[PDB]
Every structure is written in C-alpha cells, then in structure tokens.
Amino acid sequence: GRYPFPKDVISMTGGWWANPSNWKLNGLFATGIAVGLALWVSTATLPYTRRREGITSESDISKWNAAAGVWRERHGKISTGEA
Amino acid sequence: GPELTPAVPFFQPYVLKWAGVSLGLVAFYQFNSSYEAKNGHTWVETFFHPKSRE
Amino acid sequence: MFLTSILLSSLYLFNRILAWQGNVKHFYLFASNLLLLFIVVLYINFNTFSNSFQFNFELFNSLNPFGLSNSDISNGLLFGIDGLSLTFILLTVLLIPLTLLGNWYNINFNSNLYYTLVLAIGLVILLNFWALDYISFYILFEATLPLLFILIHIYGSSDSERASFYVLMFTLSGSLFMLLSIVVISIVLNTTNFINHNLFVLSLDLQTIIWLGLFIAIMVKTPLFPIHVWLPVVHSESPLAGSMILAGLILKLALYAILRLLLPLLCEAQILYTPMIYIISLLTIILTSLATLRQIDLKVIIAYSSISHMGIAILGVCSNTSLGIYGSIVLGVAHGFVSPALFLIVGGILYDRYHIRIVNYYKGLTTYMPQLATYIIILSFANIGTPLTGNFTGEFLSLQGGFIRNPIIGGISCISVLLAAIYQLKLTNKLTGGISSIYMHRTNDVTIREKFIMNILIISTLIIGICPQIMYNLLYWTVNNYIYII
Amino acid sequence: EHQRPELVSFDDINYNDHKKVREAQESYTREQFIRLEALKTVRKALEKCYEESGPNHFEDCKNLAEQYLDMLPTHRLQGYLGYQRNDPSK
Amino acid sequence: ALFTSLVGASGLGFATKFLSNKIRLKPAGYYPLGYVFSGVAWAGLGLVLHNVHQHSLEVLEKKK
Amino acid sequence: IRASFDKAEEPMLGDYPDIDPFPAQLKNPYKKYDDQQDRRNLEEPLSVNDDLYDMWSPDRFTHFKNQDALKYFIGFLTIFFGASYVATYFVPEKAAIPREFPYEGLWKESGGTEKSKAFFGQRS
Amino acid sequence: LRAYNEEKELALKQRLSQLPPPGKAFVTAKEAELAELAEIAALYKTDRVGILDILLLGNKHARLYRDNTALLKDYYYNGRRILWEIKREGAEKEDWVNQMYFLYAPSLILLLIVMVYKSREDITFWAKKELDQRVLDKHPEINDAPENERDALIVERIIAGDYDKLASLQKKAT
C-alpha cells in the first residue's frame, strides 16, 4: 500500500515501517545477547532440574508408610470406608 | 528493495537503564549466593542490626 | 542539643530556598525523597522476630510537652509499628513524591500553596500508621480533611463546590460514628491503646453496639452500599494528586483501620456479624461494578473500579482466616499501586491535554500515541486481575478466604473477576480502536516524567506479581494476630 | 544464628505484665508454625510417593494420603486470641 | 525537661510574629526585633506553666 | 420513545429536546457523515441513552425479531433434548458382559480394606 | 565555592527593563531581535547561584535574583514553544531528574534489595530448622547416620512422631 505516515512519533514497536539502516549491524548485538542469554540461563537452571522417577528408594517411601501407620494407630483412626 | 528507514543507535539510554540495573541486580544476587560457604551468611545481613527481642 | 539544632538549621535552609528560589517544588521533593531513606534505614534495623512493636515513642506527654518522654506515667500520644503498620508506610513513601511529581508542569497558580498542601496531607497519613491509641489514630484520621477540603475546592475541575462539600460531608458523617465507639471504649477501658486490648474482653451486647459504630464508620470510608454516594463525585472534580492520594491511601487507611481497630477486640461480635458484612460486601461489589458500565465521565469509571477492589478486600479482612488477611494486604498494596497510575491515565496525562473527561470524544488514540496505548492497556489488564501483577494474587487469596468463612457468598463473590473486566475492557477498546477522532488534534506524547511514574508503578505491581513473598517477612505475625477461630 | 526462645503458656501468667503475655503469644505462634511444618513435610513426602509409585500409589501410601487429609483441618493458623480470650473447663 | 518545653513555647511566639506579619501584608522577616519579644513572652508562659506543673506533682506525692 | 425504558426515562428530562433514538449501526453506511467511523455527522443531537445506540453499542441483529427468535432457539433445544430422551427408550442392549477383575476386583490394589471393600471392588 | 556575580546581576535587570513582554516576544510568527533574545535565554541556563553563597546574604539580592530568574525562565521557554532555540538536540536533561534518578530510584532499588534478603529471615525457614532441631533433641541417634540418610530419617520421625507439644499449652482443657 505504502501510504504516507507521520514520521514524528516514536513507538516502542518502531511504528509503521521501521526499516533502520544498520539492521545488519544491530542484529549482531541482539542475537549476541540472545544466544548469550540462553546458555547462561540453561546452566543456571541445570542444578534445579531433576529426574522425576527414581529420586529415592522404594524402601524410604515404604518406611514412610510405616511411619504413617505408627502415627495413625496412635490417633486411632477408622478407615475411609468403615462406618 | 525493502525501502530502508534511517539508522538508529543500538544502546538507547533506557536500554542502558533497564539492562544495567537488572543484570547488575542479578550479579549482585549471585555475589551474595557466593557467600554460602565463603562467609556463612549474606553480605547485607551484616548491614542488618535489629535490636534483639528482649 | 544536636537533634534540636538539626531543625534549627533546616528551617533556615528552608527560608533561604524560599528567598532565592521562587518555588520550593524542588525542596519539597528533596524532603519527601529523603523520607524514603529515613524509613528504609528504619526498615533495615527492623526486628522481624517480634510481634512486639519496635520503634516506639511518645509525644505530648506531661513531663515533656514538646518531644520525647521517658516516664512511668504517660497520658500522651503513643507511636509505634509492626509489619501491618509498616508496609502501608512503605506504600506511602514510594507514592508521595510521585504525586508530588505528578503536578510538576501542571499548576501555574499559587504553587507554593498547592505543593505544601499535597505534601502536608501525606505527612498526616504517615503518622496515621505510626499511631497506637484510639485518640491518636483518630486525631490525624481527619487532619486530612482541612487540607483535603482546600485542595478540592481550589484546583477543582468544575462544580468543585459540591465535590469539596461531599468529601467533607460523608467523611465527617462516618468520622463522628467512629468517634462514638472510640469514646465508649475510652470510658469502658480507659485505655486508648493498640497493645493492651487483646487482654480485654467486653460483654456481648456492648461489643455489639460498639461494632455498630465502627462498622458504619468504615462503611463510609471504604465505600459500602449506603455510601459511595461521594466516591464518584469527589474523584471526578479532584485535582490530580488529590485524587491519587485519596484512592491510593485513604481507602487502604480505612482498610488498615478495620484490621487494627475492629477485629482484635471485636472477636466475639463479628462472628455473629460477618454475614451482615457479607451481604453488603458482595452487594457493593456487584452493584457498583454493574454501575460502571453506563458512565460517561472518564475518571468516574476508574473511581468505581477503586470501589470494586475494596469490596473484595474487606471480605478477606473479615474472613477470620489466614489467607484472607494476607490477601487483604496484598490487595491493598497492589490497588494502591495500580489505581493512581490509572488516575495518571485520566487526570494525569489526558486532562492536561484536552481538559475534558468525557469518554465519547476519545477514540483511535493508538494511531498518534502508541507508546501511550501500551501503558493504557497493560495497566488496564492489571486492573482486571490478571496474574503476575499482584492484583489477582490478592483477589485469589481473598476470594478463597471469603469462600472459607461462608462458601456460597464466596461462590457468588467469584464473578467479580468477570465484573471487573467488563467495564475495563469496554473502556480500553473504545480508547484504543477506531480512527483517531475528528475532535482531536495531535498533541504531545507521553513525556519523560509521565513515562517515569508509570515505569515505577507498573514494576511495583510486577514485583509483587512475580513474588508476593517479597513483603511476607513482615506480615506473618499479623496473619496470625487477628484470628479468633479458637 | 538459630535462637530458641522458650514456650510460655497462657495459663498462670498473670495478664497484667506485657512481658509474659507477649512471650506467650509469640510462643503459641511459633509453635503453631512448628505444627504447620508437619503438614508441609508430609505433603513433600506424599508427592514423592506419587512420583515413584506410578499406578500402585493407591496401595503404597494410602496411609500417607489419609494422613495428609487428616492433618488438614488441624494444622493451620488459628489465632492466639481464641485460647487467650476464653477458658476451657469453664 | 524544662529547656525543651521552653524551646517549643518560644517557637509558638515565633509563629505569632510570623502570622501577624502575614496579616499585616509584610514579608516574613519584616520587624525582626519583635521575634525576640514574642520569643520571650510565650516562653515566659512556659516558664510559669511548667512551674505550675512541678508544684502540682509534689502535692500528689504528699498524699501517700 | 422507542423502547420501554426510553419511555420510562421521558419524565426525568426537563430541558433536553427528547429526540427519537435510532441505532447508528442500522443507519446505512453509504451516506457520508462527518464521523465515518461512527456514521455520525458532527452537530447531531444525541439520544438520551446514547450508548445503546452508539456503534459501540452491541450488535442488535436485524433479521429475526427478538421475541420471535427466542422461540426458534428453544425449539431447537426441544427437538434435540426430547428426541434424545426418546432414544433412551429405543436403545438396544449390548452383546457382551462388562469384563470382570481378579483379586476380588482389585479392591486391595486401589488401597482399600475388607471393611472398606464396599467403596471399591469391580466385578469380583 | 560557587560564588555568584553581583554587578552583572545588577546590570541584568537594566537589560530586562527594556525588553518586550513574553506575550509579545515571539508573536512574530528575523534576527533583528531574535538573535539577542535566544542568547538572553542562555542566562537561565548559565548557572550562577552559589551553593554556600545564598546563605550569607540579604533579601534584596534574593528578590532581585528572583525577578531575574522569573523573566529568564519566561524567555527560555517561550521561544522553545516557537523554535538557544533554533536547535534540535535532546541534551538539557530536566529539572526533577537530579534528585530522582540519583536519590529516588536507587533508594527504591535498595528497598527492593532489603525486602528480598530480609525474607531469608523467614518464619518458614526458621520453623523448618527448629523442627529439624527437635527431632535431634528427642532422637540424637540419627546423627550417627551419614549425610544423605539423615534427612529421610528425620522425615520418618516427622511422619511417625507428633513433635509439636501444643497440648502442653492447653493444660486448662484437662
């Protein structure tokens, strides 16, 4: 279409047809940030990740159920289906 | 010919403001998480001096 | 000797800045800005481990009328904080230069009047949160009102006589009925105090009627249904900073009052009387938010928006639960952020550019101010209660607590998420879309300072929206301190 | 430093000095957080049961699951006022 | 403290001359010597009134 | 004038001219007004209750009458749900048994107790 | 030692007295009058004030300064609303930007910092470590395990034991 547009206002998105001249140059910076962002984050998030299945033993969780029974018998609790 | 608009400097003053403040805060945060074993407590906790409760 | 000489020097500095500079608009900012650093260093040496009130001092004692006192007998005015008392000061002090900023290129008529007034009412509501006695909390609860009345009547938009009248009238109406219950508990206990009263009980029939005083005090000040008479037509003619400080501070001050005054010694009457609260609370959400949709004035929509959050806030207050209290505080601080930025949208930016606040003139604003339109939209989206802004973080906790205390009133309370959004987007799309209106010349864009206030306030919402736990290290006492579920 | 101030009841503390009253309030407060940490820890363990188990979590940690659901009404903030403003056996 | 009370009472007198100039449409500092007079007289009341209050307290102490 | 509330808003005004309201969307677009975005010439006397006759007012479909179209929608409701309920009387039964389960219906596998067997057990 | 000029400031009002009003000064939509006035506007920018110097002086000097700076403010901004004026460069920062970017914003950032790090002093962290303490206090045998086991053994005790002592505070009940 290419209708005339008032070039006075400065928008954060650039405006109507932002085609600035050093786009070959400034893209060397932002992508240099972008890659430089991502690998910097991915290492930092690395010790915060974990494998879901198989983090502890079944023996630990079964002893936790044993501790549940020891707790619940001391409180004297009926089952969910007992009436 | 994609009809190029005039050139613009990259580091506009707010880009300096936002990026410098934010990434300096992150570097400051990990400067204090350096002090897990180097000092046993954070650097700013030294600046804390509350009265004891008693 | 030294602390006296500080003021003895500073008033001389003040006189010479009066002499050489014409405006003290620079030095007003210079004082109000240093008030931050003062209160922040007070925040540094804060003991978080104490429910115990930390920074205590007395004024106007017998043995020292002018200043500090250390006596075994004290009839003066107590001052001190914790947590709950603290954050709202921290709500205040990062707000009060901004509205003091807010009128910088605005006034051009009796400036040394106007900015002194704007700073002065804020200095009053500072010490409102420092107060510890029912007398002392009361005596600056309306020291607002002189310099509020003058600030509304002069610098009013048009028909400000009626506006200044109503901000006297209804506030004074609720003010007296506050004082009734204050006098009753000050002759039953003979201790105006925010410390001793947890030790005290009342008879149930007495505790009934003193609640009946305090509750229709706060019904005025946080506008529930027989009030918000005045709330539209006090904003709609207010000048910029006065409307901002009203909707950011006075509402949350009464929200603080119902936490501070009522709840801890109204434990035995309010369990009877929360459904009386909840009828009116749900009602003043739904009725006001439905009344938003047909409003022709631009500022008045943001005013009824300021109702519709506080309606959610007070049911979390009287939820008698944990999440309700914490949600009430985060609603208060988030609305005190997001709302004065909206008054910057209507009265701050736009009213300086066109002097008319009728909605129907304003459409197609995007085409000549895109970097206004951004700050239009995301601030509106914060007013709805999207997450990641603290507004939903407050809404969810308080709707949950109100769901605890009575589930059906919370189930109908939850539709306020819809009802807040309807008018906000009905306003926003009409401002945004369409051709730029024929009534409208191209004016100057958002200035640097008007980008700047928005930059502070939006980030202040977003910090709490990413992490509401940034301020949890204060409130966790008071989250416990006001529950009577035995 | 991980300090440990003492626990003070609301029974027989003579509700006139602010010292013992405030200590009892803070004690019944901090101890309630201690009571809350049981709920938080058993939730932290119960989700790990669900992580490892896959299908047989129904019979692996049924007692842990109903342990969580039994602790839920009795582990929350409850206010020091309710025990303070009233007395049982009276 | 007696001196801290005196400073406040003389500040009240300073405000008296400060207000009186502003009704007289004078500047802030117009007749500076008057700030001394008002600086004494109101302070003199703080002389008297505190001397009252001293003499009050001891009477209560003599009734025990 | 037009609607019920419009005639129920007439005795309020004292000095307004009481014009006839008409939806500006339902004005034709090919007349050339001032506001082409809103089909509105400049000094036009607006309606009492303007915002239900704005372009920004809701759409107000014009083909069916409102009261008439309500009947068509509820007729679609009835012809669906009633005939679906009729098909419940016309359904044939199926050919196999629902399948059973070992370990007395895996009541032990879904947690359970012999006392709590009644809230479990699938085709033992 | 920012000590300002006296006699130049005497002479400034002598120029000012001959000047046409600001409501006239740019109503002519060249440089027979524009070239002097948009360099008079630099006297609003020229920054002779005196930090300590304003303290040590009299009210006549202050009033004369005030009238000077008022008219200089006028002629600085009026031709800015027309057109030094015939320039286009954003390098003049502003008035408020000194004590806000250098006081307000860094203090706000400091406030953010302190609010983050004070949350390390949490009731939750401290209740967690106190609950860890009490399990060691009743059962110090779990110290004998190495590092990895001790956490899960505490968890076994937490699920097993009660460890709250809250009924001790409620001795009025029984």
Q: Is A28 exposed, middle or buried (0-12, 13-18, 19+ CB in 10 A)?
A: exposed
Can you tell me which residue has the tokens 């000489």? C5
Within 8 A by CB and 6+ apart from C64, the residues are E1, E4, E5
Residues C64, E4: C-beta atoms closer than 8 Å: yes
Rounded distance between C-alpha atoms, residue G107 and residue G102, angstroms? 8
Specify whether the CB–CB gap between G59 and E27 falls below 8 A. Answer: yes
Indicate the DSSP class of residue F22: -
Q: How far apart are CA C163 and CA C166, in angstroms?
A: 5
Q: Does D84 touch chain G (CB under 8 A)?
A: no
Q: Which of D63, D66, D74 is the best mutation test for A, with the most CBs of A within 10 A? A: D63
Residue C77 phi/psi, 5-degree rounding, is -125, 115
C86/B50 Cα distance (integer angstroms): 15
What is the DSSP track for G134-154?
HHHHH-GGGGGS-HHHHHHHH
Q: G157 CA to chain A: closest CA distance, Å?
A: 7
**Measured between CA atoms, how close is E29 to chain C, in angstroms?**
10
Q: How many other CB atoms sit within 10 Å of the CB of residue C457? A: 25
Burial of C129 (C-beta count, 10 Å sphere; 0-12/13-18/19+): buried
Tokens representing C414 are 């939850």
Residue C445 φ then ψ, to 5°: -70, 180
Method: cryo-EM
Phi/psi-derived region of residue F48, left when phi > 0, alpha when psi is between -120 and 50, beta in every other case? beta
Single-letter amino acid, residue C79: F
Q: Which amino acid is at G20?
A: P
Q: Which helix (H) or strand (E) holds E57?
A: helix E33-61
Could you give the CA distance from residue F69 to residue C108 in angstroms, rounded to a whole number?
Answer: 60
Cβ pair D75, G131 in contact under 8 A: no
Alpha-carbon distance of G38 to G85, in angstroms, equals 6
C324 three-class SS: helix
Which of C387, C446, G96, B6 is closest to A12 using CA atoms?
A: C446
Q: How far is D61 from chain C (nearest CA, A)?
A: 29
As to burial, measured by CB atoms within 10 angstroms (0-12 exposed, 13-18 middle, 19+ buried), residue E7 is middle
User: What residues does each domain of chain E span?
Assistant: 1-64
The distance in angstroms from the start CA to the end CA of chain G is 80
Q: What is the largest CA-CA distance in chain C?
A: 73
CA F53 to chain centre: 22
Query: If you count DSSP H runs as helices and E runs as strands, how many of each does chain D have, helices first?
Result: 4, 0
C411 Rama sector, left if φ>0, alpha if ψ -120 to 50, beta otherwise: alpha
**E64 class by beta-carbon count within 10 Å (0-12 exposed, 13-18 middle, 19+ buried):** exposed
Are D78 and D4 contacting, i.e. CB atoms less than 8 angstroms apart?
Answer: no
Inter-residue contact D42 to D64 (CB < 8 Å)? yes
What ranges in C106-159 are assigned the alpha helix state H?
A: 111-130, 134-139, 144-153
Chain G residues whose beta carbon lies within 8 Å of the beta carbon of residue A63: 156
β-partners of residue C58 are C78
Neighbours of C73 (CB within 10 A): 10
Please check whether residue A43 touches G, CB under 8 A: no
Structure tokens at C218: 């706060």
The residue among C215, C219, C222, C211 whose CA lies nearest residue C185 is: C211
Short-list C482, C324, C289, CA closest to C402: C324
- Which residues of C are less than 8 Å from F51 in CB distance? 294, 296
DSSP string, C240-281: HHHHHHIIIIIHHHHHHHIIIIIHHH-HHHHHHHHHHHHHHH
Tell me whether residues A11 and C370 touch, CB distance under 8 A: yes
Give C297's DSSP letter.
B
Query: Is D78 an 8 Å CB contact of chain G?
Result: no
Q: Which of C262, C248, C133, C162 is nearest to C208 (CA)?
A: C262
| Contact partners, residue C466, CB within 8 Å, separation at least 6 | C388
Closest to F50 (Cα-Cα) out of F9, F82, F15: F9
Token representation of residue C114 = 């106007």
Report d(CA C85, CA C478) in Å as an integer: 10
Rounded to a whole number of angstroms, the distance from the CA of D59 to the nearest CA of chain F is 4
The residue extents of the domains of chain D are 1-90
Query: How many CB contacts within 8 angstroms connect chain B with chain G?
Result: 15
CA distance linking residue G151 with residue G155, whole number of Å: 6
List the subunits that have 3+ CB pairs under 8 angstroms with G: A, B, C, D
The CA-atom distances, in angstroms, between F114 and each of A79, A83, D61, F105 are 10, 12, 17, 12
Resolution in angstroms comes to 4.0
Q: How far is CA D30 from CA A28, C165, C178, D5, E44, in A?
A: 56, 49, 34, 10, 55
Q: Count other C-beta atoms under 10 Å from residue A40's C-beta.
A: 12
**Distance from the first to the final alpha carbon of chain D:** 42
